[PDB]
Amino acid sequence: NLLSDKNVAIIGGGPVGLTMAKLLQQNGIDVSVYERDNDREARIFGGTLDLHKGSGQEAMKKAGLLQTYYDLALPMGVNIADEKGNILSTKNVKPENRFDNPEINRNDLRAILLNSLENDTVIWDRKLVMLEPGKKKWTLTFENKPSETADLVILANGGMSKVRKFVTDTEVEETGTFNIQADIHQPEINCPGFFQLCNGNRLMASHQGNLLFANPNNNGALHFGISFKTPDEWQVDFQNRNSVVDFLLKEFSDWDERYKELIHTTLSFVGLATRIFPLEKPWKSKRPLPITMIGDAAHLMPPFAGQGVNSGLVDALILSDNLADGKFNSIEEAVKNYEQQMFIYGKEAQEESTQNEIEMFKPDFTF
Ligand SMILES: Cc1cc2nc3c(=O)[nH]c(=O)nc-3n(C[C@H](O)[C@H](O)[C@H](O)COP(=O)(O)OP(=O)(O)OC[C@H]3O[C@@H](n4cnc5c(N)ncnc54)[C@H](O)[C@@H]3O)c2cc1C
Ligand SMILES: [Xe]
Ligand SMILES: [Xe]
Secondary structure (H helix, E strand, O other): OOOOOOEEEEEOOOHHHHHHHHHHHOOOOEEEEEOOOOOOOOOOOOOOEEOOOOOHHHHHHHOOOHHHHHHHOEOOOEEEEOOOOOEEEEEOOOOOOOOOOOEEOHHHHHHHHHHHOOOOOEEOOOOEEEEEEOOOOEEEEEOOEEEEEEOEEEEOOOOOOOOOOOOOOOOOEEEEEEEEEEEEOOHHHHOHHHHHHHOOOEEEEEEOOEEEEEEEEEOOEEEEEEEEEOOOOOOOOOOOHHHHHHHHHHHOOOOOHHHHHHHHHOOOOEEEEEEEOOOOOOOOOOOOOOEEEOOHHHHOOOOOOOOOHHHHHHHHHHHHHHHOOOOOOOHHHHHHHHHHHHHHHHHHHHHHHHHHHHHHOOOOOOO
């Protein structure tokens, strides 16, 4: 290894960072994962993920985890509906379909990942707040915890990473759209009409630049997302479910009872403005010590065309091969190369999601 006598700090034990830690650790590199979450049982809010043949699945295969992912994932069909509840299209799971991109729960994926690492690989309740380039090592500062040091820092702490200044002055941007999400438990009881519309399939619906996306079966809960162009007036407060309900009922008034049932029945809503971390300018080439970024820290992008975790998992695949060698002259060259590649497929991805976001939130969209 170019790492033989050294050690690696991965900031962030998301799917991407945990994957990075796996791939490095099986080449016998010393790696720790510093994670913000309080412990391994922290619930991860969100829909399910799906790993694609060619990308995410490749990373998993290399970790020897594909079969496990297949074991836990649920292949799903997709229904496309109008605001009036007519099914316009059902694409079902077929024999050949089955392994293409089965849905996995985010906690589930993390349990598979965590399980593959040696004990104490991840250090919990570690929120990285500061980063300083020492004599030969990075000094890592954690909120109300003892500082650590590392030879190589890998930022995998997601799209809103505050700790990026040594790589790039690029800032996260809002794209102009906005997402509301909620979970519904016992959906067969709590939103029967809608649960029945979904019929064990995912559902996508579109009316007047308001998108609805639901998975009826995220480990037994209905998860759903509503997306729209951010209202120029931004007026809603996500603390107050009453104010979020009011706004959704006005925006969705045109929609069938069964979609409204969804809003009435939701106890609380997560709001989020869609953000991008653009791969616009090249990153800094004068860097004090070895540092890099993978996943959403590297290339946060709108989620709407199913880009996201797969790109990040490729980043993990590419970087760990790059470092598992007597192939590059130095860690610095192994990072340089990783970033050169990632700029290409990353940029392509970002274009695809950006166009899609423009496409989707046009007045007259048609899936
Ligand atoms: C509404 C929505 C829908 C989406 N749908 C999809 C989809 O269908 N498919 C898809 O592929 N992608 C989707 N995405 C994007 C996808 O979830 C991300 O690409 C993926 O989770 C990125 O993984 P990551 O590990 O890079 O970052 P994250 O999953 O965000 O993980 C970063 C980790 O670092 C931790 N962390 C953060 N700050 C610190 C700190 N200071 N110190 C230590 N740890 C820290 C976090 O707790 C987290 O564990 C969606 C995103 C949104 C917002
Ligand atoms: Xe909306
Ligand atoms: Xe809705």
